């Protein structure tokens, strides 16, 4: 049974290279914010891996075949170990991204998470909170899927509104949560309504501003300061020039102690949040030993990929990177064609050399099947004139060129 | 009182690595792609059945759940083929691949290894065994560490010379054992070990004769083609002369030069696993490294789960072990700790929207940058940003905001100039 074992998923080649574009352009924005990688072990000191409550997750041990070690559930805890075993060596605030693949029992068991966090040692500027949808913005307008909006919440302030109804502290936990799942509810009150009209606030951002600047009055240290460091996020967005279209503040969203995000398609609501995260005062610095800011937040890339192309948003890639094919037209010209694919590499193309002896049109046949490009054609008299013959696989263009010019010339049929 | 560092064995970068390790990954990646090898990735999970098959399994780390038998990859060969099993109706064949994955063995226990290999059908080009020297040769040259020899084999060429002497399967590859061993315990030692192994003193001296040939491609396969005439009834010695030569010859026509290339009849890798081309990979004055890239062709590998005959040809680099050998050895430099080129300082609190939005229009211009946020004095962020790496620096100050303008800071040339607009094209330019 070659199988893959069950809730471990494998992309086809087509399906990777979408994965790895995809990964290229969330390094890409991540990068030009700053953020450096790091890669910390598939596996884990158990000991790590649970330390004070951290494993609801079954966790995958490791027996030897023929000292406690588990693999990674996510990304949040390696960060905190990491920076525990490198802390005199960073820069901080430290600012990284992973892009680790991590393990769940059970509906995947084994996904891709990419995360960014910057971690400061005492204090946050609240502007790092401000990056995060810039970056979300440019990664997603990039990856070309329809538009979304990136909701914000402070969770001050739900919080801070929370305790002006005065609700009993073992009881407020219980019921600060089931709330969320509103998607007038009397199994609430063994866990009145006044709740749900704030949730319900809806607006443009200036304007939720103003109720809650306003609703200050009325009632609440907690909600004022949540509400100014909401503004203060809201206009470092702007400043950063992200447009206003982009995103709104949702004060129905749900470790957290401050800005809260979430991503979501337009019309395409019932995916969930595409992207996730916020601002913790620890999840990082269990082994640190001690409190520490952060902000980050997360793609499940694995998952948003396969939902992605099962509602035909995402048009998976050719499965080849090859973008040229030097056909084999003739034995005796396998030199001619070795050289010529290896000049039409330094011009910085993808290229493959066919091997095979086959007729002409299976080789056509092979590379549209495949989704290349571009055959060029060289048979006895065009490499006696020095010049081949290209062939485009999509429009049905056919053209003769120098050899010299082959390279330039498909460059500006790709431009 | 926990413990946070890595289990044993289990390594793991400062960003610095980490940077330029991705760096190796993306050269490696391009060269790759170039010649048209297509990316996947195998769980690091798979079946006990698929890892253990054809008792190809080398310790290897089981998974029982802490609240059906599988285990981590080991290698990547395996999956690729437990991978064609599963896709066979799906893939286009030649089917080529490569696989930058970790991989876990128990004894470094987590180790990247970056293949590529060509799996075909029934049959297999031997042009694409002589590509591997020029996707070798692009690969080195981009990473540019010094001089490099790939040096290239036929297991046929080998296994077939000791047919010629009439000895057994089983003494040939103990033969070949101990020939694999040559350099490691010289030729005094190699003599005693084949003696051991039931090889009489004419046979002794014709081995090492013949794994101890050495001169420029054209007369070590001159002087292979006088074997054949001599011993004219080793079939496969024949066949694999005339593999070697398809290949060396597909090399130069690739125009790969010959100072990057030699025989080496020597070459004795995969016990049961290589049948034609072999091929390893020596950095000149570094051969305490050993082998920087490896491989060879395979004739039946990759059929475990297909029960078709699958020819494979592939090549691996151990990028982990490499990576710290190199940086052992001095002959790589890393990376700065950030990927960040420039640093929007903070002068005056009340410029923020200025700062933000000239980051924003650099970035927009494909350069990193890092908007400062803490307000220090000019001579701790300089600081701060020089211990990173971060070469520029755009100071925006009080009057130098108004008139559309800013003071560039460069810390490799520890000199100051000031530029508006024009910003993000003289970084570049300077660049």
């Given at each position: 049974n070659f199988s893959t074992p069950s809730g471990f998923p494998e992309f086809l080649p087509s399906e990777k290279r979408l994965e790895l574009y995809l990964l290229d352009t969330i390094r890409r924005v991540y990068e030009s914010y700053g953020f450096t990688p790091i890669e910390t072990p598939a596996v884990e000191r158990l000991e790590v891996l649970q330390?004070?409550?951290?494993?609801d997750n079954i966790i995958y041990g490791l027996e030897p075949i023929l000292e406690a070690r588990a693999l990674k559930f996510d990304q949040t805890v390696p960060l905190a170990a990491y920076i525990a075993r490198h802390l005199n060596d960073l820069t901080f605030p430290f600012a990284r991204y992973q892009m680790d693949v991590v393990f769940r029992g059970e509906r995947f068991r084994q996904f891709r998470q990419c995360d960014i966090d910057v971690v400061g040692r005492e204090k946050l500027s609240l502007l790092y909170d401000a990056q995060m949808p810039a970056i979300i913005t440019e990664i997603f307008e990039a990856v070309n899927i329809g538009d979304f909006v990136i909701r914000i919440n402070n969770r001050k302030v739900l919080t801070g509104f929370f305790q002006s109804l005065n609700i009993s502290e073992t009881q407020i936990k219980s019921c600060i949560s089931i709330i969320?799942?509103?998607?007038?509810?009397?199994?609430?009150?063994?866990?009145?309504?006044?709740?749900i009209d704030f949730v319900k606030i809806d607006g443009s951002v200036d304007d939720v501003l103003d109720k809650l600047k306003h609703l200050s009055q009325t009632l609440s240290e907690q909600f004022n300061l949540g509400v100014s460091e909401l503004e203060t996020v809201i206009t470092g967005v702007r400043n950063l020039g992200v447009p206003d279209k982009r995103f709104c503040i949702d004060l129905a969203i749900a470790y957290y102690t401050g800005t809260v995000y979430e991503t979501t398609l337009i019309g395409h609501e019932?995916?969930?949040?595409?992207c996730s995260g916020g601002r913790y005062e620890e999840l990082v610095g269990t082994f640190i030993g001690e409190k520490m800011p952060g902000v980050g937040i997360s793609i499940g890339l694995t998952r948003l990929i396969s939902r992605l192309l099962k509602a035909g948003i995402l048009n998976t890639l050719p499965?080849?990177?090859?973008?040229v094919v030097v056909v084999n037209?003739?034995?005796?010209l396998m030199p001619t064609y070795l050289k010529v694919s290896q000049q039409l590499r330094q011009a910085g193309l993808n290229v493959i050399t066919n091997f095979e002896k086959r007729q002409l049109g299976k080789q056509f046949q092979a590379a549209d099947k495949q989704g290349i490009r571009f055959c060029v054609i060289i048979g006895a008299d065009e490499a006696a004139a020095q010049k081949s013959s290209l062939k485009d696989?999509?429009?049905?263009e056919q053209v003769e060129v120098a050899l010299a010019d082959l390279a330039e010339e498909i460059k500006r049929r790709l431009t």
């Open positions: 330390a004070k409550g951290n494993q969320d799942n509103l998607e007038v509810k009397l199994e609430l009150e063994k866990e009145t309504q006044k709740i019932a995916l969930g949040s595409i499965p080849t990177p090859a973008q037209m003739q034995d005796e696989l999509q429009s049905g």
